[PDB]
Amino acid sequence: GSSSGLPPGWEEKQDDRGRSYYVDHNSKTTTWSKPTMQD
Amino acid sequence: APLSPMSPPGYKLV
């Protein structure tokens, strides 16, 4: 807990092609998705 | 399949 932005266990970083992707450490899988906002 | 299909490279390489 420290503000909010990335889900628990998500790394935001660029791939070989140089695009910012996200990887979920929960299942351990790279998934290029844009995190939704629930407010 | 409990794991999501990876589209961009980097993780696990390929």
mmCIF file of all heavy atoms in Angstrom:
data_model
loop_
_atom_site.group_PDB
_atom_site.id
_atom_site.type_symbol
_atom_site.label_atom_id
_atom_site.label_comp_id
_atom_site.label_asym_id
_atom_site.label_seq_id
_atom_site.Cartn_x
_atom_site.Cartn_y
_atom_site.Cartn_z
ATOM 1 N N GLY A 1 0.828 -1.223 0.000
ATOM 2 C CA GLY A 1 0.000 0.000 0.000
ATOM 3 C C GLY A 1 0.849 1.253 0.000
ATOM 4 O O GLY A 1 1.672 1.448 0.893
ATOM 5 N N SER A 2 0.667 2.073 -1.020
ATOM 6 C CA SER A 2 1.337 3.361 -1.139
ATOM 7 C C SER A 2 0.765 4.065 -2.359
ATOM 8 O O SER A 2 1.330 3.988 -3.450
ATOM 9 C CB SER A 2 2.863 3.198 -1.270
ATOM 10 O OG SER A 2 3.529 4.451 -1.252
ATOM 11 N N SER A 3 -0.392 4.702 -2.174
ATOM 12 C CA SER A 3 -1.164 5.252 -3.286
ATOM 13 C C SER A 3 -1.624 4.110 -4.198
ATOM 14 O O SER A 3 -1.598 2.943 -3.791
ATOM 15 C CB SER A 3 -0.340 6.288 -4.055
ATOM 16 O OG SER A 3 0.034 7.360 -3.207
ATOM 17 N N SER A 4 -2.067 4.424 -5.401
ATOM 18 C CA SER A 4 -2.530 3.397 -6.320
ATOM 19 C C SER A 4 -2.170 3.750 -7.757
ATOM 20 O O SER A 4 -2.087 4.925 -8.115
ATOM 21 C CB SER A 4 -4.040 3.203 -6.172
ATOM 22 O OG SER A 4 -4.364 2.764 -4.861
ATOM 23 N N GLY A 5 -1.941 2.723 -8.562
ATOM 24 C CA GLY A 5 -1.575 2.916 -9.950
ATOM 25 C C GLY A 5 -1.376 1.596 -10.648
ATOM 26 O O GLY A 5 -2.019 1.303 -11.655
ATOM 27 N N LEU A 6 -0.476 0.792 -10.098
ATOM 28 C CA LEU A 6 -0.255 -0.556 -10.592
ATOM 29 C C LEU A 6 -0.874 -1.578 -9.646
ATOM 30 O O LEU A 6 -0.814 -1.417 -8.425
ATOM 31 C CB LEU A 6 1.241 -0.843 -10.749
ATOM 32 C CG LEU A 6 1.984 0.044 -11.749
ATOM 33 C CD1 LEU A 6 3.439 -0.379 -11.849
ATOM 34 C CD2 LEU A 6 1.319 -0.016 -13.115
ATOM 35 N N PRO A 7 -1.499 -2.629 -10.193
ATOM 36 C CA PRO A 7 -2.024 -3.730 -9.387
ATOM 37 C C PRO A 7 -0.900 -4.493 -8.679
ATOM 38 O O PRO A 7 0.260 -4.436 -9.104
ATOM 39 C CB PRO A 7 -2.732 -4.628 -10.410
ATOM 40 C CG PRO A 7 -2.927 -3.773 -11.616
ATOM 41 C CD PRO A 7 -1.766 -2.825 -11.626
ATOM 42 N N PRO A 8 -1.226 -5.209 -7.586
ATOM 43 C CA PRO A 8 -0.232 -5.949 -6.799
ATOM 44 C C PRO A 8 0.557 -6.957 -7.638
ATOM 45 O O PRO A 8 0.032 -7.997 -8.041
ATOM 46 C CB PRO A 8 -1.069 -6.679 -5.744
ATOM 47 C CG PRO A 8 -2.332 -5.901 -5.653
ATOM 48 C CD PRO A 8 -2.583 -5.352 -7.029
ATOM 49 N N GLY A 9 1.812 -6.620 -7.920
ATOM 50 C CA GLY A 9 2.683 -7.532 -8.633
ATOM 51 C C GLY A 9 2.789 -7.221 -10.116
ATOM 52 O O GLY A 9 3.065 -8.112 -10.914
ATOM 53 N N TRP A 10 2.576 -5.966 -10.489
ATOM 54 C CA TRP A 10 2.695 -5.550 -11.886
ATOM 55 C C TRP A 10 3.948 -4.721 -12.114
ATOM 56 O O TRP A 10 4.223 -3.769 -11.383
ATOM 57 C CB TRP A 10 1.464 -4.751 -12.320
ATOM 58 C CG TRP A 10 0.283 -5.609 -12.666
ATOM 59 C CD1 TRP A 10 -0.242 -6.625 -11.924
ATOM 60 C CD2 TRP A 10 -0.531 -5.510 -13.843
ATOM 61 N NE1 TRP A 10 -1.319 -7.175 -12.574
ATOM 62 C CE2 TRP A 10 -1.516 -6.506 -13.753
ATOM 63 C CE3 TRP A 10 -0.516 -4.673 -14.963
ATOM 64 C CZ2 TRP A 10 -2.481 -6.690 -14.742
ATOM 65 C CZ3 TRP A 10 -1.472 -4.859 -15.945
ATOM 66 C CH2 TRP A 10 -2.445 -5.859 -15.829
ATOM 67 N N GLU A 11 4.717 -5.098 -13.124
ATOM 68 C CA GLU A 11 5.861 -4.304 -13.535
ATOM 69 C C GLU A 11 5.564 -3.585 -14.840
ATOM 70 O O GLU A 11 5.093 -4.195 -15.804
ATOM 71 C CB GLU A 11 7.108 -5.163 -13.715
ATOM 72 C CG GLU A 11 7.847 -5.488 -12.427
ATOM 73 C CD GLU A 11 9.097 -6.312 -12.680
ATOM 74 O OE1 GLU A 11 9.928 -5.906 -13.522
ATOM 75 O OE2 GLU A 11 9.234 -7.386 -12.065
ATOM 76 N N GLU A 12 5.831 -2.290 -14.859
ATOM 77 C CA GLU A 12 5.674 -1.482 -16.054
ATOM 78 C C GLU A 12 7.043 -1.244 -16.693
ATOM 79 O O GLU A 12 7.901 -0.586 -16.105
ATOM 80 C CB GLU A 12 5.006 -0.149 -15.689
ATOM 81 C CG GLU A 12 4.872 0.813 -16.856
ATOM 82 C CD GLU A 12 4.312 2.156 -16.440
ATOM 83 O OE1 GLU A 12 5.041 2.925 -15.783
ATOM 84 O OE2 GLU A 12 3.147 2.455 -16.785
ATOM 85 N N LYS A 13 7.257 -1.802 -17.879
ATOM 86 C CA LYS A 13 8.540 -1.662 -18.562
ATOM 87 C C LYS A 13 8.390 -1.938 -20.051
ATOM 88 O O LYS A 13 7.401 -2.519 -20.478
ATOM 89 C CB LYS A 13 9.591 -2.593 -17.940
ATOM 90 C CG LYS A 13 9.142 -4.042 -17.816
ATOM 91 C CD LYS A 13 10.139 -4.857 -17.010
ATOM 92 C CE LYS A 13 9.646 -6.279 -16.790
ATOM 93 N NZ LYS A 13 10.515 -7.028 -15.842
ATOM 94 N N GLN A 14 9.368 -1.500 -20.835
ATOM 95 C CA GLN A 14 9.313 -1.647 -22.288
ATOM 96 C C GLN A 14 9.853 -2.999 -22.745
ATOM 97 O O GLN A 14 10.726 -3.586 -22.096
ATOM 98 C CB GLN A 14 10.057 -0.490 -22.974
ATOM 99 C CG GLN A 14 11.523 -0.338 -22.575
ATOM 100 C CD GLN A 14 12.485 -0.980 -23.560
ATOM 101 O OE1 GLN A 14 12.926 -0.344 -24.520
ATOM 102 N NE2 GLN A 14 12.829 -2.234 -23.326
ATOM 103 N N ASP A 15 9.314 -3.487 -23.858
ATOM 104 C CA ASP A 15 9.713 -4.774 -24.426
ATOM 105 C C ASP A 15 10.850 -4.589 -25.430
ATOM 106 O O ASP A 15 11.480 -3.536 -25.487
ATOM 107 C CB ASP A 15 8.526 -5.437 -25.134
ATOM 108 C CG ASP A 15 8.197 -4.778 -26.456
ATOM 109 O OD1 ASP A 15 7.942 -3.557 -26.477
ATOM 110 O OD2 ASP A 15 8.219 -5.483 -27.480
ATOM 111 N N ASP A 16 11.097 -5.623 -26.223
ATOM 112 C CA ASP A 16 12.102 -5.571 -27.281
ATOM 113 C C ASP A 16 11.734 -4.514 -28.318
ATOM 114 O O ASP A 16 12.601 -3.802 -28.835
ATOM 115 C CB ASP A 16 12.222 -6.947 -27.947
ATOM 116 C CG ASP A 16 13.240 -6.980 -29.073
ATOM 117 O OD1 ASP A 16 12.953 -6.447 -30.165
ATOM 118 O OD2 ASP A 16 14.321 -7.572 -28.881
ATOM 119 N N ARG A 17 10.443 -4.392 -28.604
ATOM 120 C CA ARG A 17 9.965 -3.431 -29.588
ATOM 121 C C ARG A 17 9.972 -2.018 -29.013
ATOM 122 O O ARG A 17 9.815 -1.034 -29.745
ATOM 123 C CB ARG A 17 8.558 -3.795 -30.061
ATOM 124 C CG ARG A 17 8.440 -5.196 -30.646
ATOM 125 C CD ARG A 17 9.428 -5.426 -31.780
ATOM 126 N NE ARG A 17 9.198 -6.704 -32.453
ATOM 127 C CZ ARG A 17 10.127 -7.650 -32.602
ATOM 128 N NH1 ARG A 17 11.351 -7.484 -32.106
ATOM 129 N NH2 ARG A 17 9.832 -8.773 -33.241
ATOM 130 N N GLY A 18 10.125 -1.925 -27.699
ATOM 131 C CA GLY A 18 10.306 -0.639 -27.055
ATOM 132 C C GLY A 18 9.015 -0.033 -26.550
ATOM 133 O O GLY A 18 8.975 1.157 -26.234
ATOM 134 N N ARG A 19 7.961 -0.831 -26.459
ATOM 135 C CA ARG A 19 6.683 -0.319 -25.994
ATOM 136 C C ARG A 19 6.481 -0.672 -24.528
ATOM 137 O O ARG A 19 6.899 -1.736 -24.072
ATOM 138 C CB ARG A 19 5.527 -0.856 -26.848
ATOM 139 C CG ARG A 19 5.158 -2.307 -26.574
ATOM 140 C CD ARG A 19 4.041 -2.780 -27.493
ATOM 141 N NE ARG A 19 2.888 -1.875 -27.461
ATOM 142 C CZ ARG A 19 2.493 -1.146 -28.504
ATOM 143 N NH1 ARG A 19 3.111 -1.271 -29.674
ATOM 144 N NH2 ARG A 19 1.479 -0.297 -28.381
ATOM 145 N N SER A 20 5.862 0.231 -23.788
ATOM 146 C CA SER A 20 5.615 0.010 -22.375
ATOM 147 C C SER A 20 4.544 -1.061 -22.185
ATOM 148 O O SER A 20 3.376 -0.845 -22.511
ATOM 149 C CB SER A 20 5.178 1.314 -21.721
ATOM 150 O OG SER A 20 6.002 2.389 -22.138
ATOM 151 N N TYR A 21 4.952 -2.220 -21.694
ATOM 152 C CA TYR A 21 4.018 -3.286 -21.399
ATOM 153 C C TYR A 21 3.948 -3.510 -19.894
ATOM 154 O O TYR A 21 4.684 -2.883 -19.125
ATOM 155 C CB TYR A 21 4.409 -4.589 -22.123
ATOM 156 C CG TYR A 21 5.623 -5.297 -21.555
ATOM 157 C CD1 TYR A 21 5.493 -6.187 -20.497
ATOM 158 C CD2 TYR A 21 6.894 -5.089 -22.075
ATOM 159 C CE1 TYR A 21 6.586 -6.846 -19.972
ATOM 160 C CE2 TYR A 21 7.997 -5.745 -21.558
ATOM 161 C CZ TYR A 21 7.838 -6.623 -20.507
ATOM 162 O OH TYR A 21 8.935 -7.270 -19.982
ATOM 163 N N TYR A 22 3.061 -4.402 -19.486
ATOM 164 C CA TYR A 22 2.896 -4.739 -18.087
ATOM 165 C C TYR A 22 3.005 -6.240 -17.896
ATOM 166 O O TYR A 22 2.525 -7.016 -18.721
ATOM 167 C CB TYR A 22 1.540 -4.252 -17.580
ATOM 168 C CG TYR A 22 1.368 -2.750 -17.616
ATOM 169 C CD1 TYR A 22 0.927 -2.094 -18.760
ATOM 170 C CD2 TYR A 22 1.648 -1.988 -16.495
ATOM 171 C CE1 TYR A 22 0.775 -0.721 -18.780
ATOM 172 C CE2 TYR A 22 1.497 -0.618 -16.507
ATOM 173 C CZ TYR A 22 1.061 0.011 -17.652
ATOM 174 O OH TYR A 22 0.912 1.380 -17.667
ATOM 175 N N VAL A 23 3.644 -6.655 -16.820
ATOM 176 C CA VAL A 23 3.737 -8.070 -16.505
ATOM 177 C C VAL A 23 3.172 -8.353 -15.116
ATOM 178 O O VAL A 23 3.554 -7.716 -14.129
ATOM 179 C CB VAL A 23 5.188 -8.600 -16.619
ATOM 180 C CG1 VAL A 23 6.141 -7.791 -15.756
ATOM 181 C CG2 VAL A 23 5.251 -10.076 -16.244
ATOM 182 N N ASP A 24 2.242 -9.298 -15.068
ATOM 183 C CA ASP A 24 1.607 -9.710 -13.826
ATOM 184 C C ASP A 24 2.402 -10.837 -13.180
ATOM 185 O O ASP A 24 2.645 -11.868 -13.805
ATOM 186 C CB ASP A 24 0.173 -10.178 -14.088
ATOM 187 C CG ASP A 24 -0.451 -10.796 -12.858
ATOM 188 O OD1 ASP A 24 -0.972 -10.043 -12.011
ATOM 189 O OD2 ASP A 24 -0.393 -12.032 -12.716
ATOM 190 N N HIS A 25 2.844 -10.622 -11.949
ATOM 191 C CA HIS A 25 3.608 -11.630 -11.219
ATOM 192 C C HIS A 25 2.714 -12.646 -10.511
ATOM 193 O O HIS A 25 3.216 -13.590 -9.898
ATOM 194 C CB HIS A 25 4.550 -10.974 -10.212
ATOM 195 C CG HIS A 25 5.715 -10.292 -10.862
ATOM 196 N ND1 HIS A 25 6.719 -10.981 -11.505
ATOM 197 C CD2 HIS A 25 6.018 -8.979 -11.007
ATOM 198 C CE1 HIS A 25 7.583 -10.128 -12.010
ATOM 199 N NE2 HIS A 25 7.185 -8.907 -11.725
ATOM 200 N N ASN A 26 1.401 -12.461 -10.583
ATOM 201 C CA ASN A 26 0.480 -13.365 -9.898
ATOM 202 C C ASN A 26 0.414 -14.706 -10.616
ATOM 203 O O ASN A 26 0.635 -15.754 -10.008
ATOM 204 C CB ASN A 26 -0.921 -12.753 -9.766
ATOM 205 C CG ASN A 26 -0.959 -11.569 -8.815
ATOM 206 O OD1 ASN A 26 -1.138 -11.734 -7.608
ATOM 207 N ND2 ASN A 26 -0.813 -10.368 -9.353
ATOM 208 N N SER A 27 0.132 -14.680 -11.913
ATOM 209 C CA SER A 27 0.198 -15.890 -12.713
ATOM 210 C C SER A 27 1.581 -15.994 -13.349
ATOM 211 O O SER A 27 2.029 -17.081 -13.727
ATOM 212 C CB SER A 27 -0.910 -15.887 -13.772
ATOM 213 O OG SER A 27 -1.036 -14.611 -14.371
ATOM 214 N N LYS A 28 2.257 -14.842 -13.391
ATOM 215 C CA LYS A 28 3.584 -14.694 -13.990
ATOM 216 C C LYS A 28 3.457 -14.703 -15.500
ATOM 217 O O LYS A 28 3.741 -15.704 -16.156
ATOM 218 C CB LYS A 28 4.557 -15.770 -13.509
ATOM 219 C CG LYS A 28 4.719 -15.801 -12.000
ATOM 220 C CD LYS A 28 5.550 -16.987 -11.541
ATOM 221 C CE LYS A 28 4.963 -18.312 -12.010
ATOM 222 N NZ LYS A 28 3.525 -18.453 -11.645
ATOM 223 N N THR A 29 3.021 -13.573 -16.029
ATOM 224 C CA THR A 29 2.630 -13.462 -17.417
ATOM 225 C C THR A 29 2.647 -12.007 -17.868
ATOM 226 O O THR A 29 2.182 -11.123 -17.150
ATOM 227 C CB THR A 29 1.213 -14.026 -17.627
ATOM 228 O OG1 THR A 29 0.452 -13.917 -16.417
ATOM 229 C CG2 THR A 29 1.264 -15.469 -18.087
ATOM 230 N N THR A 30 3.187 -11.763 -19.046
ATOM 231 C CA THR A 30 3.180 -10.434 -19.625
ATOM 232 C C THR A 30 1.874 -10.195 -20.372
ATOM 233 O O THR A 30 1.501 -10.965 -21.255
ATOM 234 C CB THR A 30 4.386 -10.245 -20.565
ATOM 235 O OG1 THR A 30 5.554 -9.988 -19.786
ATOM 236 C CG2 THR A 30 4.172 -9.114 -21.558
ATOM 237 N N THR A 31 1.178 -9.137 -20.001
ATOM 238 C CA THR A 31 -0.096 -8.819 -20.604
ATOM 239 C C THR A 31 -0.165 -7.323 -20.903
ATOM 240 O O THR A 31 -0.140 -6.486 -19.998
ATOM 241 C CB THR A 31 -1.274 -9.271 -19.692
ATOM 242 O OG1 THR A 31 -2.539 -8.979 -20.301
ATOM 243 C CG2 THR A 31 -1.203 -8.620 -18.315
ATOM 244 N N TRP A 32 -0.187 -6.982 -22.183
ATOM 245 C CA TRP A 32 -0.253 -5.588 -22.578
ATOM 246 C C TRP A 32 -1.691 -5.099 -22.462
ATOM 247 O O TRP A 32 -2.513 -5.279 -23.366
ATOM 248 C CB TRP A 32 0.300 -5.431 -24.007
ATOM 249 C CG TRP A 32 0.107 -4.084 -24.640
ATOM 250 C CD1 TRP A 32 -0.123 -3.856 -25.963
ATOM 251 C CD2 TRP A 32 0.121 -2.795 -24.008
ATOM 252 N NE1 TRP A 32 -0.249 -2.515 -26.201
ATOM 253 C CE2 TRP A 32 -0.111 -1.838 -25.018
ATOM 254 C CE3 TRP A 32 0.301 -2.353 -22.693
ATOM 255 C CZ2 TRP A 32 -0.165 -0.473 -24.750
ATOM 256 C CZ3 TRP A 32 0.248 -0.999 -22.430
ATOM 257 C CH2 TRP A 32 0.016 -0.073 -23.454
ATOM 258 N N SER A 33 -1.982 -4.508 -21.317
ATOM 259 C CA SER A 33 -3.284 -3.951 -21.027
ATOM 260 C C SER A 33 -3.122 -2.594 -20.360
ATOM 261 O O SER A 33 -2.109 -2.332 -19.707
ATOM 262 C CB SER A 33 -4.075 -4.905 -20.127
ATOM 263 O OG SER A 33 -5.398 -4.442 -19.924
ATOM 264 N N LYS A 34 -4.100 -1.724 -20.536
ATOM 265 C CA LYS A 34 -4.113 -0.465 -19.815
ATOM 266 C C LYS A 34 -5.019 -0.580 -18.594
ATOM 267 O O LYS A 34 -6.224 -0.795 -18.731
ATOM 268 C CB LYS A 34 -4.551 0.688 -20.723
ATOM 269 C CG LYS A 34 -3.501 1.100 -21.751
ATOM 270 C CD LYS A 34 -2.490 2.105 -21.197
ATOM 271 C CE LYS A 34 -1.675 1.546 -20.035
ATOM 272 N NZ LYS A 34 -0.671 2.527 -19.536
ATOM 273 N N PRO A 35 -4.428 -0.477 -17.387
ATOM 274 C CA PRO A 35 -5.161 -0.597 -16.120
ATOM 275 C C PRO A 35 -6.370 0.332 -16.042
ATOM 276 O O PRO A 35 -6.275 1.528 -16.341
ATOM 277 C CB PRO A 35 -4.118 -0.206 -15.071
ATOM 278 C CG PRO A 35 -2.808 -0.527 -15.702
ATOM 279 C CD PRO A 35 -2.985 -0.244 -17.167
ATOM 280 N N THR A 36 -7.502 -0.222 -15.638
ATOM 281 C CA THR A 36 -8.735 0.536 -15.533
ATOM 282 C C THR A 36 -8.798 1.306 -14.219
ATOM 283 O O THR A 36 -8.111 0.970 -13.254
ATOM 284 C CB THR A 36 -9.953 -0.399 -15.640
ATOM 285 O OG1 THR A 36 -9.635 -1.681 -15.075
ATOM 286 C CG2 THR A 36 -10.381 -0.564 -17.089
ATOM 287 N N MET A 37 -9.618 2.345 -14.192
ATOM 288 C CA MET A 37 -9.785 3.153 -12.997
ATOM 289 C C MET A 37 -11.180 2.970 -12.424
ATOM 290 O O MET A 37 -12.175 3.178 -13.117
ATOM 291 C CB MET A 37 -9.538 4.632 -13.305
ATOM 292 C CG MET A 37 -8.120 4.925 -13.771
ATOM 293 S SD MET A 37 -7.880 6.659 -14.208
ATOM 294 C CE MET A 37 -6.157 6.658 -14.706
ATOM 295 N N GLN A 38 -11.253 2.560 -11.168
ATOM 296 C CA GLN A 38 -12.531 2.409 -10.493
ATOM 297 C C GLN A 38 -12.640 3.417 -9.368
ATOM 298 O O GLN A 38 -11.961 3.293 -8.347
ATOM 299 C CB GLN A 38 -12.696 1.001 -9.937
ATOM 300 C CG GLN A 38 -12.582 -0.087 -10.988
ATOM 301 C CD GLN A 38 -12.910 -1.453 -10.441
ATOM 302 O OE1 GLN A 38 -12.093 -2.000 -9.679
ATOM 303 N NE2 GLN A 38 -13.993 -1.982 -10.762
ATOM 304 N N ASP A 39 -13.486 4.407 -9.557
ATOM 305 C CA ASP A 39 -13.628 5.484 -8.600
ATOM 306 C C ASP A 39 -15.083 5.903 -8.505
ATOM 307 O O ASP A 39 -15.645 5.865 -7.388
ATOM 308 C CB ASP A 39 -12.753 6.676 -8.996
ATOM 309 C CG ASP A 39 -12.858 7.817 -8.007
ATOM 310 O OD1 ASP A 39 -12.336 7.681 -6.883
ATOM 311 O OD2 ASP A 39 -13.465 8.847 -8.350
ATOM 312 N N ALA B 1 -6.222 -23.107 -18.767
ATOM 313 C CA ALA B 1 -5.178 -22.068 -18.889
ATOM 314 C C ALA B 1 -5.374 -20.979 -17.847
ATOM 315 O O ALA B 1 -6.247 -20.124 -17.992
ATOM 316 C CB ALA B 1 -5.190 -21.467 -20.290
ATOM 317 N N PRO B 2 -4.567 -21.004 -16.773
ATOM 318 C CA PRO B 2 -4.625 -19.997 -15.708
ATOM 319 C C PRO B 2 -3.716 -18.795 -15.985
ATOM 320 O O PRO B 2 -3.733 -17.800 -15.257
ATOM 321 C CB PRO B 2 -4.120 -20.782 -14.499
ATOM 322 C CG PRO B 2 -3.135 -21.757 -15.059
ATOM 323 C CD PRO B 2 -3.544 -22.034 -16.491
ATOM 324 N N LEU B 3 -2.915 -18.908 -17.036
ATOM 325 C CA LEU B 3 -1.971 -17.860 -17.411
ATOM 326 C C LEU B 3 -2.444 -17.135 -18.665
ATOM 327 O O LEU B 3 -3.010 -17.753 -19.571
ATOM 328 C CB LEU B 3 -0.580 -18.458 -17.644
ATOM 329 C CG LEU B 3 0.379 -18.394 -16.446
ATOM 330 C CD1 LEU B 3 -0.209 -19.075 -15.221
ATOM 331 C CD2 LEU B 3 1.719 -19.010 -16.812
ATOM 332 N N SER B 4 -2.211 -15.830 -18.707
ATOM 333 C CA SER B 4 -2.635 -14.995 -19.828
ATOM 334 C C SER B 4 -1.625 -15.055 -20.979
ATOM 335 O O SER B 4 -0.418 -15.119 -20.753
ATOM 336 C CB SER B 4 -2.815 -13.558 -19.338
ATOM 337 O OG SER B 4 -3.807 -13.530 -18.310
ATOM 338 N N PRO B 5 -2.113 -15.052 -22.235
ATOM 339 C CA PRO B 5 -1.250 -15.091 -23.422
ATOM 340 C C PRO B 5 -0.453 -13.795 -23.596
ATOM 341 O O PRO B 5 -1.019 -12.702 -23.619
ATOM 342 C CB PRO B 5 -2.234 -15.290 -24.580
ATOM 343 C CG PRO B 5 -3.535 -14.763 -24.077
ATOM 344 C CD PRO B 5 -3.543 -15.008 -22.590
ATOM 345 N N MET B 6 0.863 -13.933 -23.708
ATOM 346 C CA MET B 6 1.752 -12.782 -23.820
ATOM 347 C C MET B 6 1.885 -12.337 -25.269
ATOM 348 O O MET B 6 2.220 -13.133 -26.148
ATOM 349 C CB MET B 6 3.137 -13.117 -23.247
ATOM 350 C CG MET B 6 3.095 -13.627 -21.818
ATOM 351 S SD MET B 6 4.734 -13.813 -21.086
ATOM 352 C CE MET B 6 5.498 -14.957 -22.238
ATOM 353 N N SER B 7 1.614 -11.065 -25.518
ATOM 354 C CA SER B 7 1.723 -10.513 -26.861
ATOM 355 C C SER B 7 3.113 -9.904 -27.117
ATOM 356 O O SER B 7 3.761 -10.269 -28.099
ATOM 357 C CB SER B 7 0.608 -9.494 -27.100
ATOM 358 O OG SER B 7 -0.659 -10.145 -26.955
ATOM 359 N N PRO B 8 3.611 -8.988 -26.255
ATOM 360 C CA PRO B 8 4.950 -8.439 -26.420
ATOM 361 C C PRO B 8 6.014 -9.302 -25.734
ATOM 362 O O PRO B 8 5.742 -9.954 -24.725
ATOM 363 C CB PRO B 8 4.843 -7.067 -25.758
ATOM 364 C CG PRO B 8 3.797 -7.221 -24.700
ATOM 365 C CD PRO B 8 2.942 -8.413 -25.073
ATOM 366 N N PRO B 9 7.238 -9.323 -26.290
ATOM 367 C CA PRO B 9 8.351 -10.125 -25.759
ATOM 368 C C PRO B 9 8.941 -9.546 -24.469
ATOM 369 O O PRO B 9 8.435 -8.573 -23.919
ATOM 370 C CB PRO B 9 9.387 -10.049 -26.884
ATOM 371 C CG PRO B 9 9.129 -8.723 -27.503
ATOM 372 C CD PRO B 9 7.637 -8.560 -27.483
ATOM 373 N N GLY B 10 10.019 -10.157 -23.995
ATOM 374 C CA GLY B 10 10.713 -9.645 -22.831
ATOM 375 C C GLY B 10 10.666 -10.612 -21.668
ATOM 376 O O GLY B 10 11.704 -11.064 -21.178
ATOM 377 N N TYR B 11 9.460 -10.943 -21.233
ATOM 378 C CA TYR B 11 9.279 -11.869 -20.124
ATOM 379 C C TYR B 11 9.299 -13.291 -20.657
ATOM 380 O O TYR B 11 8.520 -13.625 -21.547
ATOM 381 C CB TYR B 11 7.960 -11.579 -19.410
ATOM 382 C CG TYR B 11 7.938 -11.949 -17.949
ATOM 383 C CD1 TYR B 11 8.646 -11.212 -17.008
ATOM 384 C CD2 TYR B 11 7.179 -13.022 -17.510
ATOM 385 C CE1 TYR B 11 8.592 -11.537 -15.668
ATOM 386 C CE2 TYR B 11 7.124 -13.358 -16.175
ATOM 387 C CZ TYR B 11 7.832 -12.611 -15.258
ATOM 388 O OH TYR B 11 7.773 -12.930 -13.923
ATOM 389 N N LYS B 12 10.217 -14.100 -20.126
ATOM 390 C CA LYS B 12 10.444 -15.469 -20.601
ATOM 391 C C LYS B 12 11.117 -15.450 -21.976
ATOM 392 O O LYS B 12 11.312 -16.496 -22.601
ATOM 393 C CB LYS B 12 9.128 -16.257 -20.661
ATOM 394 C CG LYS B 12 8.463 -16.445 -19.307
ATOM 395 C CD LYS B 12 9.242 -17.418 -18.441
ATOM 396 C CE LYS B 12 8.630 -17.553 -17.057
ATOM 397 N NZ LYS B 12 9.265 -18.641 -16.274
ATOM 398 N N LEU B 13 11.499 -14.245 -22.407
ATOM 399 C CA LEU B 13 12.106 -14.007 -23.715
ATOM 400 C C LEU B 13 11.111 -14.263 -24.844
ATOM 401 O O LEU B 13 10.495 -13.321 -25.346
ATOM 402 C CB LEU B 13 13.382 -14.838 -23.902
ATOM 403 C CG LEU B 13 14.515 -14.519 -22.921
ATOM 404 C CD1 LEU B 13 15.712 -15.423 -23.174
ATOM 405 C CD2 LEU B 13 14.925 -13.058 -23.028
ATOM 406 N N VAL B 14 10.954 -15.524 -25.236
ATOM 407 C CA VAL B 14 10.027 -15.897 -26.301
ATOM 408 C C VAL B 14 9.392 -17.249 -25.992
ATOM 409 O O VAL B 14 10.138 -18.254 -25.965
ATOM 410 C CB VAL B 14 10.720 -15.992 -27.683
ATOM 411 C CG1 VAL B 14 9.729 -16.418 -28.755
ATOM 412 C CG2 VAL B 14 11.386 -14.684 -28.066
#
